[PDB]
DNA sequence: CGTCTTCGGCAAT
DNA sequence: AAATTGCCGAAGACGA
């Protein structure tokens, strides 16, 4: 029902005053940490890349969860793919400020993460904030209300790795030209061990690209810039995130839904966007149909145990090695029930 | 639909 | 030398 769904979206709208106070807290702490990190020889080129739901304007309910990336431009990077995981890599260099973190010829994520956490932990000790598989490296809690997931990332301005070359299938949606422009942007490597865990791997990150697409998301260049062209893409993504968040809350005592994340819902949403490239397939009048497309596609991913990373097609976020069949069957069952009953979890 | 706020990029430092 | 900073305007909450 499109009218019930719109009522859900109204309840999900963030408070402008809450945004204001929350942003003030996050920005103060983040700037404090960046200022400290830039004083260290190792994190000399550190910069802020804001990522995730809040900076994509798909944060729901309250602005109480911020993801930030502390990125380091690194020179002359040489990637070695770990096994054939397609997303995990050993970092090498082709005399540089990260030489202390080298363990042989590979860059030690562990060594780097340790100094990163150490510096942040020390800086938080003097601030009302507290510190709490490598990425996010650190989670802050500001005034018991606001959580900040801080991810260390290497920035490579090199062309994207070969495993991405069939990814980002935006050609018929955002255009081949936009795909070419996005793939000229840097890519990021975050410390993330690969599963026995290889503790020195880095995973490809494209959070900046994900943010760019979401804030410039139409086939039409003027999508959502005027009244006539307000699509429901972000509305559906928010509904999908609320659906997952509510299901995860409703079954928090069970453990089946713990591994599912907003990134899964966001990734699925980008695939539905690829399957539905035209803004007219996201008309505001069709919020119900569009949400059901997202729900249906997500259920297909659960059932087939395939949710491709939007950028790395052979990296299956729903692989057996990542999420148990039983966890997907459980989500499938609950989503199917939810849909068959006008989504009871939305009222709560 | 105008007002207000926040964020992102980047000349100008 | 190269990291810092102020400024612009889109995005979105909000009230009228
Ligand atoms: Zn739009």
Which domains does chain A possess? 1-14+160-186+206-348 (1.10.1410.40), 15-159+187-205 (3.30.460.90)
Tokens of A25: 């807290």
- What nucleotides of chain B have any atom within 7 angstroms of a protein Cβ? 1, 4-9
CA A293-A170-A223 angle, to 5 degrees, is 70
- What nucleotides of chain C have any atom within 7 angstroms of a protein Cβ? 3-4, 10-14
List the A17 CA – B7 C1' distance (angstroms). Answer: 16
**Under 8 Å CB-to-CB from A167, ≥6 apart: which residues?**
A308, A309, A310, A311, A312, A313
Q: How far is the CA of A276 from the centre of ligand 1 (A)?
A: 13
Residue with tokens 């057996």: A320
Q: How far is the CA of A204 from the centre of ligand 1 (A)?
A: 27
Tokens of A301: 């991913």
Q: How far is the CA of A290 from the centre of ligand 1 (A)?
A: 13
* Full 3-state SS string of A63-111: CCEEEEEEEEECCCEEEEECCCCCCEEEEEECCCCCHHHEECCEECHHH
User: Residue A37: helix, strand or coil by DSSP?
Assistant: helix
Nearest nt to the CA of A47 via C1' is C3
Q: Using a CB cutoff of 8 Å and minimum separation of 24, what contacts does A329-336 make?
A: A329/A302, A330/A251, A330/A254, A330/A256, A330/A257, A331/A247, A331/A256, A331/A257, A331/A260, A331/A302, A332/A299, A332/A302, A332/A303, A334/A247, A334/A250, A334/A251, A335/A243, A335/A247, A335/A295, A335/A298, A335/A299, A335/A302, A336/A299
Residues A112 and A29: beta-carbon distance below 8 Å? no
**Number of Cα atoms under 13 Å in the Cβ half of residue A341:** 11
List the A296 CA – B2 C1' distance (angstroms). Answer: 39
Residue with tokens 């601030």: A127
- Nearest CA among A183, A279, A277, A195 for reference residue A230: A279
- Nearest CA among A72, A74, A70 for reference residue A34: A70
Residues A116 and A152: beta-carbon distance below 8 Å? yes
C-alpha to C-alpha distance for A161 and A123, rounded to whole angstroms: 35
Residues A26 and A148: beta-carbon distance below 8 Å? yes
Partners of residue A68 on adjacent β-strands: A50, A150
DSSP A199-263: TT-EEEE-HHHHHHHHHS--SSTTTTTSSTT-BSHHHHHHHHHHHHHHHHHHTSSSSTTTT--HH
List the A332 CA – B6 C1' distance (angstroms). Answer: 38
Binding-site annotation, residues of A: 51, 53, 65-67, 149, 192, 203-210, 217, 223-224, 231, 241, 262-266
Which window residues (216-275, chain A) lie with Cβ within 7 Å of strand B?
227
- Nearest CA among A323, A340, A338 for reference residue A256: A323
List the A314 CA – B1 C1' distance (angstroms). Answer: 47
**Under 8 Å CB-to-CB from A103, ≥6 apart: which residues?**
A110, A111, A200
Report how far Cα A195 is from the mean position of its chain's Cα atoms. Answer: 20
Report how far Cα A286 is from the mean position of its chain's Cα atoms. Answer: 26
User: Residue A138: helix, strand or coil by DSSP?
Assistant: strand
Q: Does nucleic acid strand B have an atom less than 7 angstroms from the CB of A141?
A: no
List the A34 CA – C2 C1' distance (angstroms). Answer: 16
Q: Does nucleic acid strand B have an atom less than 7 angstroms from the CB of A285?
A: no
Length of chain A equals 348
Nearest nt to the CA of A224 via C1' is C11
Residues A70 and A139: beta-carbon distance below 8 Å? no
List the A228 CA – B2 C1' distance (angstroms). Answer: 18
Nearest nt to the CA of A55 via C1' is B7
Q: Does nucleic acid strand B have an atom less than 7 angstroms from the CB of A211?
A: yes
Q: Using a CB cutoff of 8 Å and minimum separation of 24, what contacts does A10-13 make?
A: A11/A61, A12/A60, A12/A61, A12/A238, A12/A242
Binding-site annotation, residues of A for Zn(2+): 217, 223-224, 231
- Nearest CA among A68, A44, A240 for reference residue A140: A68
Residues A188 and A211: beta-carbon distance below 8 Å? no
* The CA-based dihedral angle spanning residues A22, A284, A212, A309, taken in that order and rounded to the nearest 10 degrees: 100
Handedness of CA A218, A220, A225, A231 (dihedral sign): negative
List the A215 CA – C11 C1' distance (angstroms). Answer: 8
Residues A314 and A162: beta-carbon distance below 8 Å? no
Handedness of CA A12, A8, A348, A299 (dihedral sign): negative
């Amino acid at each position: 029902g499109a009218s019930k769904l719109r009522a859900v979206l109204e309840k999900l709208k963030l408070s402008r005053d809450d945004i204001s106070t929350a942003a003030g807290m996050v920005n103060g702490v983040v700037d404090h940490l960046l200022r400290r990190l830039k004083c260290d020889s190792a994190f000399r080129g550190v910069g802020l890349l804001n990522t995730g739901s809040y900076y994509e304007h798909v944060k729901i309910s309250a602005p109480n969860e911020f993801d930030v990336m502390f990125k380091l431009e690194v020179p002359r990077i040489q990637l070695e793919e770990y096994s054939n995981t397609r997303a995990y890599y050993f970092v090498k260099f082709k005399e540089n400020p990260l030489s202390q973190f080298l363990e042989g010829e590979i860059l030690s994520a562990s060594k780097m993460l340790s100094k990163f956490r150490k510096i942040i932990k020390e800086e938080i000790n003097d601030i009302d904030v507290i510190m709490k598989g490598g990425s996010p490296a650190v989670t802050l809690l500001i005034s018991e209300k606001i959580s900040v997931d801080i991810t260390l990332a290497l920035e490579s301005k090199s062309s994207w790795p070969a495993s991405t070359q069939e990814g980002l299938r935006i050609q018929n949606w955002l255009s081949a030209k936009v795909r070419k422009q996005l793939r000229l942007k840097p890519f990021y490597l975050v410390p993330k061990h690969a599963k026995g865990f290889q503790e020195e791997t880095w995973r490809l990150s494209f959070s900046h690209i994900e943010k760019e697409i979401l804030n410039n998301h139409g086939k039409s260049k003027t999508c959502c810039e005027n009244k006539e062209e307000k699509c429901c893409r972000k509305d559906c993504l928010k509904l999908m995130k609320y659906l997952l968040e509510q299901l995860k809350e409703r079954f928090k005592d069970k453990k089946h839904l713990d591994k599912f994340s907003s990134y899964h819902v966001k990734t699925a949403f980008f695939h539905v966007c690829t399957q539905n490239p035209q803004d007219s397939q996201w008309d505001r009048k069709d919020l119900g149909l569009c949400f059901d497309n997202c729900v249906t596609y997500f259920l297909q991913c659960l059932r087939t145990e395939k949710l491709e990373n939007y950028f790395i097609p052979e990296f299956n976020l729903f692989s057996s090695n990542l999420i148990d069949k039983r966890s997907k069957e459980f989500l499938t069952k609950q989503i199917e029930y939810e849909r068959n009953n006008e989504f009871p979890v939305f009222d709560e």
